[PDB]
Amino acid sequence: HLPLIAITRNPVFPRFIKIIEVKNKKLVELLRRKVRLAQPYVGVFLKRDDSNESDVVESLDEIYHTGTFAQIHEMQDLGDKLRMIVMGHRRVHISRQLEMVEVENVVHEDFQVTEEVKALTAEIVKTIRDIIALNPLYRESVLQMMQAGQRVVDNPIYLSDMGAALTGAESHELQDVLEETNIPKRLYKALSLLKKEFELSKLQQRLGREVEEKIKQTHRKYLLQEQLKIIKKELG
Amino acid sequence: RLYKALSLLKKEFELSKLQQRLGREVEEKIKQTHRKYLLQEQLKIIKKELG
Amino acid sequence: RLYKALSLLKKEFELSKLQQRLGREVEEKIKQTHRKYLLQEQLKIIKKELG
Amino acid sequence: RLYKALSLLKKEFELSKLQQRLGREVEEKIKQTHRKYLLQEQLKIIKKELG
Amino acid sequence: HLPLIAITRNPVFPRFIKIIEVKNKKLVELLRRKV
Numbered sequence: 036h037l038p039l040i041a042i043t044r045n046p047v048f049p050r051f052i053k054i055i056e057v058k059n060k061k062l063v064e065l066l067r068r069k070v071r072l073a074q075p076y077v078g079v080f081l082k083r084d085d086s087n088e089s090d091v092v093e094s095l096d097e098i099y100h101t102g103t104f105a106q107i108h109e110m111q112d113l114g115d116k117l118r119m120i121v122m123g124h125r126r127v128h129i130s131r132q133l134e135m136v137e138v139e140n141v142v143h144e145d146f147q148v149t150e151e152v153k154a155l156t157a158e159i160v161k162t163i164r165d166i167i168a169l170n171p172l173y174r175e176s177v178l179q180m181m182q183a184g185q186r187v188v189d190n191p192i193y194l195s196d197m198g199a200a201l202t203g204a205e206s207h208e209l210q211d212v213l214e215e216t217n218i219p220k221r222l223y224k225a226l227s228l229l230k231k232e233f234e235l236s237k238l239q240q241r242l243g244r245e246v247e248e249k250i251k252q253t254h255r256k257y258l259l260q261e262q263l264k265i266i267k268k269e270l271g
Numbered sequence: 272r273l274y275k276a277l278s279l280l281k282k283e284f285e286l287s288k289l290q291q292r293l294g295r296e297v298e299e300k301i302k303q304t305h306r307k308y309l310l311q312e313q314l315k316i317i318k319k320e321l322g
Numbered sequence: 323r324l325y326k327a328l329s330l331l332k333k334e335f336e337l338s339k340l341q342q343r344l345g346r347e348v349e350e351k352i353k354q355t356h357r358k359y360l361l362q363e364q365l366k367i368i369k370k371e372l373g
Numbered sequence: 374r375l376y377k378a379l380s381l382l383k384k385e386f387e388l389s390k391l392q393q394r395l396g397r398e399v400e401e402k403i404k405q406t407h408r409k410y411l412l413q414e415q416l417k418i419i420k421k422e423l424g
Numbered sequence: 425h426l427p428l429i430a431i432t433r434n435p436v437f438p439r440f441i442k443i444i445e446v447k448n449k450k451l452v453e454l455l456r457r458k459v
Contacts (some may be wrong), residue, residue, distance in 0.1 A: 154290050185433045198316055235312065256423070258349070263422040265348050270419070329399060337414075 036135065038065065039080055039098045041091050047103055049123035050193045050199040056118055059088070063117050064233075069107075078131075079103040079121050080216045081210055095133060102127045102137075126213070143192055144218060145158055155222060156183060156191065162229050163198040165227065170236045172201055192218075195225055204228040427454065 040055075047053045069075040079101045090097045104125040111118045116196040120255055127137055146152055159182055167175055170243065181187065181194065188194050199212070430451060433457075436442040 151286060154286050156289060158294060184435070187433075194299075223297060226297075230298075230301060235316075259423050261352070262345060262348065263419075266344075266415070266422065267419055325399065327398070329403070334402070341418075343380065 037069075038077065038093070038218060039095060039132070041084055041088055041143070041247075042080065042098075043088065044086060045121075045190060046081070046206050047121045047123055048209070049103065049126055049196040051123055051197060051200040053121045053123075054118060054249065055121050056115055058124075066110075066119065075107045077107055077119070077121065079105060079123070081206060084207065087112065098132065099210060100129050100132050101210065102129060102132075104137075108232060111219060121271060126212075141215060143190075153191075156194075159226065159229075160207060160224070162226065162233075166229060169240070170232070178230070199225040199228060202228045203232050242250060 042055070043057050043123060045053065047055075048181050067076075071075075080098045083097060083099055087097070103123050104127055105122050106124065106253045108122070111120070115159065126141055127138055127139060129135065164178070167173070167178065181197075199209075202203050204224075208224075208231075212221055212224045212228070215224060430446045430448060432444075434442065434444050436444075449458045
């Protein structure tokens, strides 16, 4: 029984540390009111299209039924009075947020035959490795921490979500990926988001090299014309 | 061990090969998305700087 | 014949290095052109900001 | 051994001297070619510029 | 007569250079002891 948090354009990806800084101080009242509890906690939900804080505090249907319950860790408040750390541990989908009853329907079905099911993992890690190599966003050291050969990936779905965390794909696409129930479908969609970033990235690099070669050609040729002007002095 | 190594190279190459063709089919089905989606990505790219 | 072939190699090394030295020197003459213009440009921004 | 090594330095210097003198001569014999051949080369360089 | 190494999920194919980084520090004592 707590009010839905005003996320205010702060996407909290599953199993990915994140910070939240709402400009409103009303949430600070609730965060101080839960310090007295022996086990404070906070929930995280995702906003639908056209964010509006007044609708969030007036109606409760704007926020998606999906939530991401998590434990609180530690306050900071270096500058602002509300720099709270969120993370993604327990995903959930309330049947009706207006009504609160909840259940941990963190489905994780897997086929009994687990030999070729990891073959896709090689293509997922190779793709993720090419996104961070050709388009570095976060440190590669975390990849050195979590290697596929160490067998420490007790939760492959969490690896695929952390690898999808690197994607730049829009939050609506992530909400649709959360809507998927079948394992191959959510895996293929997270892959399609990886490719969706990859096309635009490789294009930006091709566009850059083109424009740079154009500037080079334009100046290099000017250098040739200059070599003509200097080697030809006092001959006209 | 040359026989079993040959059988392992066959089975492993068949796994990477079938993954490459099945992935080529899933990639072609993502290529089934019309080239208008690619052009519309470029249309949205035109609207970036100032305006 | 070995001395003459080495002397031809030397002759091309000489004519080549002469063309390259004149070209790098002219290029540095461009850099001396522009760089001082960047200094004068800095004078301009300083005078335009407080002059 | 000091004298044999000194004699080797003398003979090696005599070989290097005869090679450098014969080569100063071959360089002179190619230098007999007129400076007009060099100015013709720079002339051709003028004609082959800017692509 | 050496303690068993902690392979800790690190294949070392024959005639193949490989690096090992077990998280336990007890193996480091054996590495200094063999010097």
